């Protein structure tokens with residue numbers, strides 16, 4: 348038995364503690380790199396919280412057993428200066444992940460897919476406690492956001508998935524691929540950066556229109 352609840356400002360430390368236990372260690376790119384201590388990812392994870400659309404799954408003892416951290420993304424202004432996230436990162440392993448994200452954004456802009464949309468919900472960090480996996484918690488976290496979207500006239504939910512495994516979960520939830528890139532094809536300086544196990548394949552950006 349668990350609840351799905353809005354993540355509050357006072358929850359920051361508990362969210363970080365949960366992510367350090369799971370996501371930091373067991374998201375495929377993090378585990379490939381052996382991310383280790385990463386204060387900059389802690390910072391990254393806390394950033395979307397004040398948008399008031401991030402959710403926690405909580406067990407009967409009051410422990411966080413899952414999170415989906417979401418942020419609002421706004422269409423770039425016509426005079427927008429695209430910034431590289433990797434430029435403000437000291438941690439070398441996390442910088443590799445941020446560089447990958449920058450590269451995806453250079454190749455694919457979600458706002459091109461939806462020219463009429465000013466605001467899109469961005470699913471940034473999804474993590475479920477191992478002992479609670481395969482119970483549909485990812486789906487219940489995701490679906491709690493639909494309510495926020497409906498309450499605020501947001502039509503599109505955008506989620507970058509770091510493995511075909513997690514992209515499949517999003518497909519079950521009614522998302523579809525809008526962009527993909529094989530790890531074998533990601534060679535920003537001429538050589539492969541990420542070589543996780545073959546079934547991961549690469550990144551897939553997933554979208555749902557609600």
Ligand SMILES: CC(C)(COP(=O)(O)OP(=O)(O)OC[C@H]1O[C@@H](n2cnc3c(N)ncnc32)[C@H](O)[C@@H]1OP(=O)(O)O)[C@@H](O)C(=O)NCCC(=O)NCCS
Pocket residue numbers: 370373374375473474475476477479480481482483484485486507508509510513514516519
């Ligand atoms: C991706 C993740 C959030 C899914 O959460 P979840 O709540 O377990 O999602 P689901 O319940 O829908 O289970 C997904 C699939 O995992 C498999 N599964 C079943 N039991 C499982 C278990 N005990 N442990 C792990 N996976 C299991 C099943 O294939 C299941 O699909 P199905 O139930 O439709 O047959 C979770 O695996 C996770 O935290 N992964 C590591 C971090 C990560 O990669 N996050 C996503 C980045 S995009």
Ligand SMILES: CC(=O)NCCc1c[nH]c2ccccc12
Pocket residue numbers: 374376377388391444470471472473474506507508509
């Ligand atoms: C919805 C979701 O969790 N996407 C995953 C993106 C991701 C993979 N590795 C990371 C390391 C640090 C920050 C983000 C990531």
Ligand SMILES: CC(=O)NCCc1c[nH]c2ccccc12
Pocket residue numbers: 510511524527528529530547548549550551
């Ligand atoms: C269109 C399609 O079949 N997607 C699923 C498999 C796949 C092909 N290339 C990828 C690159 C990254 C992730 C997944 C993939």
